[PDB]
Design an enzyme around this catalytic site. Structure first.
Site, short mmCIF file in Angstrom:
data_model
loop_
_atom_site.label_atom_id
_atom_site.label_comp_id
_atom_site.label_asym_id
_atom_site.label_seq_id
_atom_site.Cartn_x
_atom_site.Cartn_y
_atom_site.Cartn_z
N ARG A 1 0.97 -1.21 -0.10
CA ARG A 1 0.02 0.02 0.02
C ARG A 1 0.78 1.21 -0.11
N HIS B 1 11.34 3.45 23.64
CA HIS B 1 10.79 4.64 24.37
C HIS B 1 9.41 4.33 25.15
N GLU C 1 -0.37 5.70 25.10
CA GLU C 1 -1.04 5.19 23.98
C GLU C 1 -2.24 4.40 24.31
N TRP D 1 1.18 9.01 16.27
CA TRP D 1 0.24 8.89 15.34
C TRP D 1 -0.37 10.35 14.33
N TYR E 1 -9.22 2.04 17.21
CA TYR E 1 -9.06 1.21 18.57
C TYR E 1 -9.78 1.75 19.63
N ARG F 1 -15.16 -18.98 27.13
CA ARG F 1 -14.52 -19.13 25.90
C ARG F 1 -14.73 -18.15 24.97
N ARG F 2 -15.57 -17.13 25.52
CA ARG F 2 -16.10 -15.93 24.79
C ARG F 2 -15.45 -14.68 25.16
N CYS G 1 -4.44 -2.91 13.07
CA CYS G 1 -3.45 -3.66 12.99
C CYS G 1 -3.47 -4.88 13.86
N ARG H 1 -3.17 -8.73 12.16
CA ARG H 1 -3.42 -8.93 10.84
C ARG H 1 -2.34 -8.58 9.95
N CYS I 1 1.87 -6.84 10.24
CA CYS I 1 2.95 -6.48 11.47
C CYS I 1 4.16 -5.98 10.72
N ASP I 2 4.41 -4.80 11.25
CA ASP I 2 5.54 -3.85 10.86
C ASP I 2 6.85 -4.43 11.89
N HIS J 1 5.84 -8.56 8.17
CA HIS J 1 6.98 -8.28 7.26
C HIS J 1 7.78 -7.20 7.93
N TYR K 1 9.98 -3.86 5.95
CA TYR K 1 9.98 -2.99 5.21
C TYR K 1 11.55 -3.11 4.50
N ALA L 1 6.75 3.89 7.33
CA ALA L 1 5.88 3.92 5.98
C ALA L 1 4.40 4.53 6.20
N1 LIG Z 1 4.25 1.68 8.37
C1 LIG Z 1 3.49 1.67 9.78
N2 LIG Z 1 2.68 2.63 9.85
C2 LIG Z 1 2.20 2.63 11.32
N3 LIG Z 1 1.27 3.64 11.68
C3 LIG Z 1 0.87 3.25 13.15
C4 LIG Z 1 2.00 2.36 13.31
C5 LIG Z 1 2.14 1.73 14.84
C6 LIG Z 1 2.30 2.84 15.65
C7 LIG Z 1 3.74 3.23 15.68
C8 LIG Z 1 4.09 4.71 15.25
C9 LIG Z 1 5.34 5.06 15.06
C10 LIG Z 1 6.34 4.59 15.54
C11 LIG Z 1 7.72 5.01 15.29
O1 LIG Z 1 7.93 6.11 14.29
N4 LIG Z 1 8.88 4.86 16.31
C12 LIG Z 1 9.96 5.59 16.07
C13 LIG Z 1 10.01 7.21 16.81
C14 LIG Z 1 11.11 7.07 17.96
C15 LIG Z 1 10.00 7.61 19.25
N5 LIG Z 1 8.53 7.33 19.21
N6 LIG Z 1 8.57 8.14 20.38
N7 LIG Z 1 9.58 8.75 20.59
N8 LIG Z 1 10.58 8.56 19.99
C16 LIG Z 1 11.25 4.87 16.47
O2 LIG Z 1 12.42 5.22 16.44
O3 LIG Z 1 10.88 3.98 17.44
C17 LIG Z 1 6.45 3.12 16.15
C18 LIG Z 1 4.80 2.48 16.43
C19 LIG Z 1 2.77 2.12 12.22
C20 LIG Z 1 3.92 0.82 11.96
O4 LIG Z 1 3.99 0.28 12.92
N9 LIG Z 1 4.20 0.96 10.63
C1 LIG Z 2 -17.98 -24.29 17.71
C2 LIG Z 2 -18.31 -24.40 16.32
C3 LIG Z 2 -17.19 -24.81 15.25
O1 LIG Z 2 -17.54 -24.94 14.15
N1 LIG Z 2 -16.13 -25.34 15.77
C4 LIG Z 2 -15.92 -25.85 17.12
O2 LIG Z 2 -15.07 -26.75 17.39
N2 LIG Z 2 -16.83 -25.13 18.07
C5 LIG Z 2 -16.89 -25.87 19.58
C6 LIG Z 2 -16.13 -25.14 20.61
C7 LIG Z 2 -16.93 -25.59 21.95
O3 LIG Z 2 -16.74 -26.85 22.20
C8 LIG Z 2 -18.52 -25.39 21.43
C9 LIG Z 2 -18.83 -23.89 21.49
O4 LIG Z 2 -18.97 -23.55 22.73
P1 LIG Z 2 -18.41 -22.22 23.44
O5 LIG Z 2 -19.39 -21.11 22.75
O6 LIG Z 2 -16.96 -21.99 22.93
O7 LIG Z 2 -18.76 -22.00 24.90
O8 LIG Z 2 -18.35 -25.81 20.03
C1 LIG Z 3 -0.14 -0.81 12.08
C2 LIG Z 3 -0.55 -0.44 13.65
C3 LIG Z 3 0.06 -1.09 14.43
O1 LIG Z 3 -0.39 -0.94 15.82
N1 LIG Z 3 1.05 -1.92 14.44
C4 LIG Z 3 1.69 -2.16 13.34
O2 LIG Z 3 2.49 -3.11 12.81
N2 LIG Z 3 1.00 -1.46 12.09
C5 LIG Z 3 1.58 -1.63 10.76
C6 LIG Z 3 1.18 -2.74 9.85
C7 LIG Z 3 1.62 -2.16 8.45
O3 LIG Z 3 3.03 -2.29 8.25
C8 LIG Z 3 1.22 -0.79 8.40
C9 LIG Z 3 -0.43 -0.58 8.38
O4 LIG Z 3 -0.62 -0.88 6.73
P1 LIG Z 3 -1.75 -1.71 6.24
O5 LIG Z 3 -2.95 -1.54 6.81
O6 LIG Z 3 -1.34 -3.13 6.55
O7 LIG Z 3 -1.56 -1.74 4.78
O8 LIG Z 3 1.27 -0.27 9.92
#
Ligand SMILES: Nc1nc2[nH]cc(CCc3ccc(C(=O)N[C@@H](CCc4nn[nH]n4)C(=O)O)cc3)c2c(=O)[nH]1
Ligand SMILES: *c1cc(=O)[nH]c(=O)n1[C@H]1C[C@H](O)[C@@H](COP(=O)(O)O)O1
Ligand SMILES: *c1cc(=O)[nH]c(=O)n1[C@H]1C[C@H](O)[C@@H](COP(=O)(O)O)O1
Ligand SMILES: Nc1nc2[nH]cc(CCc3ccc(C(=O)N[C@@H](CCc4nn[nH]n4)C(=O)O)cc3)c2c(=O)[nH]1
Lengths: 264, 264
Positions: free
Chosen positions: B21, B51, B58, B80, B94, B126-127, B146, B166, B168-169, B207, B209, B263
């Protein structure tokens, strides 16, 4: 299957005794992951006989956006009987959420169509997800979604998929869920002219019901056999046009079935 | 950290080049799981200086149900800024989903509170899940979640938690995400009088970058130091009443910091 039987054993060796919702009692672990290279074959358990018609119809039932067991009945599938109401309804479960996720303002989102379009127009996307976990309708469901979250992935022309299952019945549910999703990926790959990749299964509360112990021990002493091969016999105009008759499974030679009671 | 460094090496060993993206380009693997026993120490990366001040603010911000960067700003956190609008809004991200997920029927669900109630009265459920993946509102968010879905689990008087990320940077986001969620488990455990268990991390598109490669190899050439310790100096009336000053990190002696571009 190798990794399935390994998990089955891990639960026995490391499980914690928990008194669950059903009051039956389980042995459970939290957090586990498995991967299945679909190129290596269809992941349909061989250490016991499974039955495709239940797995296939439920999946087609899902893709239709149906939440009433009527369809499942015309086809002799009884798996969702113990949770359906007087009229056969289950509430806005899997099917409704996949095809018509209700927005706060009255609109509906079709996650499957969205996904299809993404796989075709933006395959690199890290947001190709389908969620059944709609917090606003949880109380209106006969049973909360077990297989609740899945994400697709494309690399080197191959389609992978990772499912997050919050709650898992290792003996009964698991074999089903694995095959169901493996099948969807094959259907997704065919409609997107892509090769199949991996099917990653991630689970939350993974358990073995206490009244399944004997059957488990029985299953653990059987050697797994070569995995079968799925053959799709037609290519429908869309992912929604698949019929039961389109699927064929070659080389499935399993050990006899094992009967066990469901925890309601 | 050991598990972290092993992930980085894994991405490098079997990652595939993928366009993304942001137009930066990545090295990527799909599906990975790691575990951190919180009893061993606070999982704050030692192979590079983190840091902590930003991580904590956050999270308090998240728990307040806030989505405007004003709060982060008055505490000098700027993580942010690149995604906020003219008014500093990020859309219903979030904070909003956690504390007020809008239902179709006009209701709003406080997922954090419901979880606290579930841990108190039905820890065997389990919910016990909190999801930020609101399909109906994704189009209103500055960036799609993310860390999208997480589940709690209780056993032997210890509180565990699994997170599905879903996307991960690995270099920038991950060290923050791991520390943030560990902190939350500690906060939940303290409110429910439970001991801290395991933090399980699960990834979708994990991933590195392309413009982080040099930094990655530099970090990998280092030996992890011993994990820091987390000390909470007070037990507030609610999970929403914590202050920055209530936390104390001791024994943190990290290798020097490594700068890398984010990024957008
Ligand atoms: N592609 C990408 N886009 C994102 N949007 C939001 C996130 C996760 C939150 C986040 C935002 C910025 C940093 C960051 O840029 N961190 C810097 C600044 C350093 C710093 N932060 N605060 N004080 N110093 C660093 O060197 O660790 C780290 C996590 C994130 C990501 O993960 N990757
Ligand atoms: C739910 C439906 C499915 O397709 N797969 C599964 O294995 N289950 C199981 C998990 C659990 O044994 C029961 C659901 O109970 P709960 O909601 O987790 O308490 O069905
Ligand atoms: C999103 C926010 C967070 O808390 N941590 C993360 O690792 N990220 C990263 C994932 C990805 O590198 C970028 C979000 O872009 P996309 O939605 O996957 O296209 O930030
Ligand atoms: N506690 C529990 N409750 C559940 N509700 C829904 C499920 C998963 C779907 C499912 C329902 C029934 C069966 C089942 O009961 N399967 C039997 C019938 C045998 C059969 N099925 N179709 N033809 N024969 C068997 O011996 O495999 C298997 C999966 C489920 C579960 O997993 N466990």
């Amino acid at each position: 299957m190798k990794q399935y039987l390994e998990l089955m054993q891990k639960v026995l060796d490391e499980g914690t005794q928990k008194n669950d919702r059903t009051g039956t009692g389980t042995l459970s672990i939290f957090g586990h992951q498995m991967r299945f290279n679909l190129q290596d074959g269809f992941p349909l358990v061989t250490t016991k006989r499974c039955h495709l018609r239940s797995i296939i119809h439920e999946l087609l039932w899902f893709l239709q956006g149906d939440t009433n067991i009527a369809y499942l009945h015309e086809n002799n599938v009884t798996i969702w009987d113990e949770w359906a109401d007087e009229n056969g309804d289950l509430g806005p479960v899997y099917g409704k959420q996949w095809r018509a996720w209700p927005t706060p303002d009255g609109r509906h989102i079709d996650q499957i169509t969205t996904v299809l379009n993404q796989l075709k127009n933006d395959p690199d996307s890290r947001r190709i997800i389908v969620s059944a976990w709609n917090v606003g309708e949880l109380d209106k469901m006969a049973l909360a979604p077990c297989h609740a979250f899945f994400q697709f992935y494309v690399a080197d022309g191959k389609l992978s998929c990772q499912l997050y299952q919050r709650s898992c019945d290792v003996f009964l549910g698991l074999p089903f869920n694995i095959a169901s999703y493996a099948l969807l990926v094959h259907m997704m790959a065919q409609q997107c002219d892509l090769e199949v990749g991996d099917f990653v299964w991630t689970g939350g509360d993974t358990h073995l019901y206490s009244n399944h112990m004997d059957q488990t021990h029985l299953q653990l002493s059987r050697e797994p056999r070569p995995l079968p091969k799925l053959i799709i016999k037609r290519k429908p105009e869309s992912i929604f046009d698949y019929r039961f008759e389109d699927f064929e499974i070659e080389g499935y030679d399993p050990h006899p079935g094992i009967k066990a009671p469901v925890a309601i």
